[PDB]
């Protein structure tokens, strides 16, 4: 059994069957806890849950076919199974906090995509929307081990460590040396020679992050607010190493709205990028153009992290959830709508040994195993 807790914005019932629009305290989700989930993922006013059985359930706003349920207008208030994938065992669903498209990776390495089709982010050599998941034919001959989705582009990496990107080319987020939109997955040849094991994609004028099995972090794309981590604000269309993170043991990378986050094996969290509304967690709202340790979590061994648009969540090895950032919709879980300028213990989870967190655009998830 897995107990699932949700809070934050719920205007389009993206919390899966709760009453109220601003859930300011983590609330037990009976619909999601009954599913026995291995992963929850949050998009733009949307929520996806992958179960141990390998099925995918979705809820929230259904505009642009972002839920993959065959519809494209209303909202689905109860987690509904993505029946298009019922003949596969899904391992992970990739979606950005401000995303209207998503991908699913099966245990045998197949990738499906669905949702908004703009700029070819779905990867079907086209710009068509997909109300239901569709197999990405271009990735069929490759054993895909991980996936990631931004708001306007997507990524996948092979078992051998090669990274593919596709979608909107503007501001260099795909990393192929130009700014051309790719309607199909294209291998980032610059990163040949590194075994990429993780990738993260941003939103709007987006950055992209990549992590290698040697602990090296690379970044490329839009440079606004220093989210590339190399100072200043200049963008680039070729992967560049973030030298500050070398030797730190980075094991997880994420991209919020205009900011980046890294977590190391020893439990340290680094953030950098746009500082507005305190999404970085350093106590101020100024920008941070090179990665900086979140001092409010020092001494706490963080084992998992999640980023929303303007908020983050971090889980300690002892099951405590810390939150920082904006709170217009209660997504901080401090019982109010007041911003957490620094990492703050979340309410209502004492006795629940949380192991994993997830975030949508303005909502938050925590669950146990």
């Amino acid at each position: 059994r897995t107990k699932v807790f949700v809070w934050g914005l719920n205007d389009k019932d993206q919390l899966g069957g709760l009453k109220g629009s601003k859930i300011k305290v983590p609330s037990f989700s009976e619909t999601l806890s009954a599913l026995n989930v291995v992963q929850v993922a949050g998009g733009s006013k949307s929520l996806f849950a992958v179960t141990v059985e390998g099925k995918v359930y979705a809820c929230g706003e259904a505009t642009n076919g972002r839920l993959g349920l065959g519809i494209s207008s209303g909202t689905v208030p109860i987690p509904r199974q993505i029946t298009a994938l019922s003949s596969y065992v899904v391992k992970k669903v990739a979606v950005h906090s401000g995303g209207r498209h998503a991908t699913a990776l099966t245990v045998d390495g197949k990738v499906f995509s669905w949702g908004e089709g703009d700029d070819g982010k779905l990867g079907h050599f086209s710009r068509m929307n997909c109300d239901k998941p569709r197999l990405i034919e271009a990735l069929k001959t490759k054993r895909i081990r991980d996936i990631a989705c931004g708001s306007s582009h997507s990524a996948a990496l092979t078992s051998s460590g090669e990274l593919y990107t596709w979608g909107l080319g503007e501001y260099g987020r795909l990393g192929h040396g130009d700014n051309t939109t790719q309607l199909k997955p294209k291998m980032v040849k610059v990163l040949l020679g590194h075994r990429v094991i993780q990738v993260a994609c941003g939103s709007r004028d987006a950055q992209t992050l990549a992590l290698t099995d040697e602990g090296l972090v690379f970044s490329w794309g839009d440079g606004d607010f220093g989210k590339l981590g190399r100072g200043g604000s200049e963008g680039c269309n070729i992967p560049q190493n973030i030298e500050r993170l070398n030797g730190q043991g980075v094991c997880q990378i994420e991209c919020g709205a205009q900011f980046s986050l890294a977590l190391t094996k020893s439990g340290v969290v680094w953030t950098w990028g746009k500082g507005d509304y305190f999404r970085l967690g350093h106590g101020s709202d100024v920008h941070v153009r090179k990665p900086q340790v979140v001092e409010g979590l020092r001494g706490k061994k963080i084992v998992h992290v999640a980023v929303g648009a303007l908020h983050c969540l971090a889980v300690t090895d002892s099951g405590q959830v810390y939150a920082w950032g904006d709170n217009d919709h209660g997504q901080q879980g401090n019982g109010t709508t007041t911003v957490n300028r620094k990492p703050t213990l979340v309410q209502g989870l004492e006795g629940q040994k949380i192991t994993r967190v997830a975030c949508g655009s303005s909502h938050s998830v925590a669950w146990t195993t």
Partner: peptide
């Protein structure tokens, strides 16, 4: 105003 802030539609 932040371009990445949701609006509570109800």
């Amino acid at each position: 105003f932040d371009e990445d802030k949701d609006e509570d539609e109800g």
